Design a protein around this motif. Structure first.
Motif, short mmCIF file in Angstrom:
data_model
loop_
_atom_site.label_atom_id
_atom_site.label_comp_id
_atom_site.label_asym_id
_atom_site.label_seq_id
_atom_site.Cartn_x
_atom_site.Cartn_y
_atom_site.Cartn_z
N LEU B 5 0.83 -1.19 0.00
CA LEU B 5 0.00 0.00 0.00
C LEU B 5 0.87 1.25 0.00
O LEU B 5 1.66 1.47 0.92
N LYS B 6 0.74 2.06 -1.05
CA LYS B 6 1.32 3.39 -1.06
C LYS B 6 0.32 4.38 -1.63
O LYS B 6 -0.65 4.00 -2.31
N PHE B 7 0.56 5.65 -1.35
CA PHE B 7 -0.44 6.69 -1.57
C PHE B 7 0.30 8.00 -1.86
O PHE B 7 1.18 8.40 -1.09
N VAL B 8 -0.03 8.63 -2.99
CA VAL B 8 0.65 9.84 -3.43
C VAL B 8 -0.25 11.06 -3.24
O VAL B 8 -1.39 11.10 -3.74
N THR B 24 2.39 10.75 2.06
CA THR B 24 2.97 9.93 1.04
C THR B 24 3.70 8.98 1.89
O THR B 24 4.15 9.35 2.97
N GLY B 25 3.79 7.75 1.49
CA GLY B 25 4.56 6.73 2.17
C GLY B 25 4.28 5.36 1.60
O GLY B 25 3.24 5.12 0.97
N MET B 26 5.20 4.44 1.85
CA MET B 26 5.07 3.04 1.44
C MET B 26 5.03 2.12 2.65
O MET B 26 5.85 2.25 3.56
N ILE B 27 4.08 1.18 2.67
CA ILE B 27 4.12 0.11 3.65
C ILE B 27 4.37 -1.17 2.85
O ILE B 27 4.14 -1.19 1.63
N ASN B 66 -1.99 -2.23 -3.57
CA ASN B 66 -1.36 -3.11 -4.56
C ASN B 66 -1.44 -2.51 -5.97
O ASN B 66 -1.64 -3.22 -6.96
N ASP B 67 -1.29 -1.18 -6.02
CA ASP B 67 -1.43 -0.33 -7.20
C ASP B 67 -2.81 -0.57 -7.82
O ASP B 67 -2.93 -0.91 -9.00
N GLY B 68 -3.86 -0.44 -7.00
CA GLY B 68 -5.21 -0.72 -7.46
C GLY B 68 -6.22 0.17 -6.77
O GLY B 68 -6.11 0.46 -5.58
N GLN B 73 -13.75 -5.11 -3.31
CA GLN B 73 -12.87 -6.25 -3.49
C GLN B 73 -11.57 -6.07 -2.72
O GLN B 73 -11.05 -7.04 -2.15
N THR B 74 -11.05 -4.84 -2.66
CA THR B 74 -9.85 -4.52 -1.90
C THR B 74 -10.14 -4.25 -0.42
O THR B 74 -9.24 -3.84 0.31
#
Lengths: 521, 521
Positions: B5-8, B24-27, B66-68, B73-74
């Motif tokens: 999960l990441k978010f811009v 912004t960050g990545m898990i 997951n870039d979705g 569904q998610t």
């Protein structure tokens, strides 16, 4: 005043569980001691044994203040601040702090010097810009949770203490608001020369560099005694060191775990009657209790609208609905008054504010004034639409019997709420007893069996119902001339002056029983 | 399952106040991200925007899992744990966790695999030795405050999430119990490959060395993004350093400040009827409500003891006290049922456990069984001592009319407690309406004026009182032969089958109105 409190070899053998197989330390007029310990270890038990609150054969050892035996001469300079802040939720913090200033300062002083001792500690603990707002609680919109702690410190900064023993003042508020609360507690020890002892539950980093002395116990054997500046330097000299960056308190808390006289009374009554006045117009003038009587005034005044006095059975159900509604509603709202303030009374009676005779009579005489506004506005509305007996003399006798019955039934709630101090265990027995008072009130049963006729003479609803009829109809004797039955219902029972002289014995006798109930608390 | 999960560039423009002018960050599947922030800054608002709970035109930016794109569904791999733990206080933690396992797992499975998915997460979150004790609350003696948080994590570890978003699980418990709670949350990310994101309010020293990644915001512009190991090394490379020994989180929190389908339904009903069964025998079989009916059985059975049916007016006050006591007591205890569970229903209906049709009918059909035990034991005791009409057929008709009146009056409390969702604002209107039902019940007033006779036909107490008389006396027609008055009281009104066919329209019609009241919540 110089308070040099030290204590040698403090012991404790509570219910047998050992607590302190230890304690020793020195505090000084300028040393802000913080007592650090883990959960349930020894923290609050040492604080109550230092402040003299717990005593007896459990305490062993000398708790000498200024090298002197603990008597109540040495307790006017104490001022232990408890953890739970017991304030009245409607007073302003001016009003919360001036009413305690008139109560717990010595009486041999003036009204204005006990108005400026309460105005000094309001601009000393940082309450000056919130000073016009209500205290409140979790329901009423009021002051913050950091400012609520500042009021309870000012409750003990009015006896002018040099020894100020706070019991976890930081447990339950912010990080930028429990920071400012400690430099005031450090400013009393640095800038005013007081001797502050506190027990912070879990500090921050810049709360630990603000402590002067740190006295730390694991489970009652005093691991560290000394300056919190020198707290690290003692343990790396003995063998324990942090293996990763830690706040210096948090390194030591898990190492504690092991992980690495007449005028006196009548003004005490007057202060407790003006303090406890917004508390008695929030109970009695609740907007849901106003609606419970405004609705009962329109239902009683439309179902019995323009009623004829010749319909004798329609009137005896009007004077029994009035005897039901004003014996249930005052007796129900009076059972919560004493349980809601058992915490505030027990603390303030112990700090010499009052002596339970001027507290009880401030609840009696303060509820004889607010409880008489809604039945007097009910019976004013439902007397000239319902068409009862016209004339000021039958009207004022209907009012004088109702307002005496409201207070005689209110005393049943005060006597049951004081004997049973639970607000819900006594709310059941006050509706069980008021059910045995309505059934034997003389309206539902007329052929009462031989053995249940002693239960109507102790009933409160009986004496109001026999009086409400005798004002409206009388001793019979004229409705028979207009009807051409009403001797089993209207005439033959206890008289009119026996039904007033027992509703006064149920007025006074239920408040003497309430005071005797509040005498082992 | 891999959840990256990441978010811009996350934005927020709530009521206009800016919240996030950032994020912004990545898990990663193995990165235990802890979101650190000051009080009220951006912490819980980011968590609900990550977990999809808040939406609409306020959210701007991509929250790609997951870039979705975020669809439901998610959201089967989500599992946001809220801060307030809403559990039923009488279920055992076996019972609390198996009943949610049968409710929120997919139905296309077996009873025992949805009994071992709830038995796996009970020996995974460390609940195995407390597993036979009651959950409880602040009144009922139960599990700890650390174990209550472990149950609410297991409420979301049953949909088998890879992304587990806790919202302050450490706020409100110990230091040695909020230590063990985090290595379980770190053990899910290290030992099970889950992707845990949490927001600790104020950590300890060995809680910060247990975080993998620390994402830290001041007021919504993401000051630190990276490993909490490397949290110091970023800021002394930029210009900020601690000037005294600090816990590494506490150094950064003030730098954030700036200080340095039919079978589906009928088993959903069956699970919600066996779950909500100890909750319905604690309400109905309260020891203060048992005493309120045991006392009303002895007062009614001694004041009317061995009563003669020839005393017609003594009977009509016995059948109106019964119509008062069982229209006030069921309608009063039924107004608290829906406000006490609005928090538990709104959360669990949103997580797909039920759909408010099987929840409402589990409250209806679960209260049609426990509310019928105390009036059936009242009227059994006070029928053969009070000497009512002998015979099984007048006895069972007195029972069938009372138990229908108990449920028809209980539906008034369910309809008012659902329209007014406050438990005290609706407790006033339920005694105002039941006061307009007793006054127009036909006993206190017989000469009702022309304009208040439409108020007796909507009354519930009227139809029970007209039925209780007609079972005991009838259509008159024989008490006149024994008395040699009773046509204004006993005979002339609505019939016997119109007084049953409206007490069924007040049974069903007050539960259709209650369900329609619970339809904008």
């Amino acid at each position: 005043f110089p308070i040099t409190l030290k204590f040698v070899d403090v012991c404790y053998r509570v219910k047998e569980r050992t607590i302190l197989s230890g304690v020793t330390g020195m505090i000084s007029p300028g040393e802000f001691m913080a007592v650090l310990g883990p959960s349930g270890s020894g923290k609050s038990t040492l604080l109550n044994a230092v402040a003299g609150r717990l005593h007896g054969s459990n305490l062993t050892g000398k708790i000498l203040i200024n090298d002197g035996k603990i008597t109540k001469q040495t307790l006017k300079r104490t001022g232990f601040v408890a953890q739970d802040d017991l304030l009245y939720p409607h007073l302003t913090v001016r009003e919360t702090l001036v009413f305690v200033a008139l109560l717990r300062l010595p009486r041999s002083l003036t009204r204005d010097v006990k108005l400026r001792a309460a105005e000094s500690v309001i601009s000393e603990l940082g309450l000056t810009k919130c000073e016009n707002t209500v205290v409140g609680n979790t329901f009423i919109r009021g002051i913050s949770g950091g400012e609520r702690k500042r009021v309870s410190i000012a409750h003990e900064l009015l006896i002018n203490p040099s020894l100020l023993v706070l019991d976890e003042p930081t447990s339950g508020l912010d990080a930028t608001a429990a920071l400012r609360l400690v430099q005031t507690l450090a400013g009393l020890a640095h800038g005013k020369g007081k001797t502050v002892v506190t027990s912070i539950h879990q500090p921050s980093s810049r709360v630990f560099q603000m402590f002067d002395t740190v006295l730390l116990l694991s489970e009652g054997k005093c691991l560290f005694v000394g300056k919190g500046r020198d707290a690290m330097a003692y343990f790396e000299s003995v063998g324990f060191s942090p293996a990763f960056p830690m706040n210096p308190a948090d390194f030591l808390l898990d190492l504690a775990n092991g992980v690495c006289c007449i005028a006196t009374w009548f003004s005490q009554l007057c202060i407790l009657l003006h303090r406890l006045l917004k508390e008695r117009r929030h109970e009695s003038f609740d907007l849901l209790r106003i609606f419970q009587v405004v609705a009962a005034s329109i239902l009683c005044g439309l179902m019995w609208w323009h009623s004829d006095y010749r319909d004798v059975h329609d009137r005896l159900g009007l004077l029994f609905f009035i005897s039901i509604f004003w014996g249930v509603l005052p007796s129900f709202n009076a059972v919560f008054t004493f349980p809601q303030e058992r915490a505030i009374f027990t603390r303030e009676r112990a700090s010499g504010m009052y002596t339970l005779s001027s507290y009880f009579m401030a609840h009696v005489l303060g509820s004889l004034s607010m409880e008489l506004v809604l039945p007097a506005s009910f019976l004013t509305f439902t007397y000239w639409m319902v068409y009862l007996r016209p004339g000021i003399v039958p009207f004022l006798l209907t009012l004088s019997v109702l307002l005496l019955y409201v207070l005689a039934s209110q005393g049943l709630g005060l006597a049951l709420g004081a004997a049973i101090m639970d607000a819900k265990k006594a709310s059941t027995i006050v509706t069980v007893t008021m059910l045995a008072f309505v059934l034997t009130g003389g309206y539902y049963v007329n052929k009462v069996p031989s053995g249940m006729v002693w239960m109507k003479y102790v009933s409160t609803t009986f004496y109001c119902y026999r009086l409400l009829v005798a004002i409206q109809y009388g001793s019979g004797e004229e409705i028979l001339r207009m009807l051409g039955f009403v001797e089993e219902e209207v005439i033959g029972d206890v008289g009119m002056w026996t039904s007033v002289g027992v509703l006064f014995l149920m007025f006074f006798g239920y408040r003497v029983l309430a005071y005797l109930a509040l005498r082992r608390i």
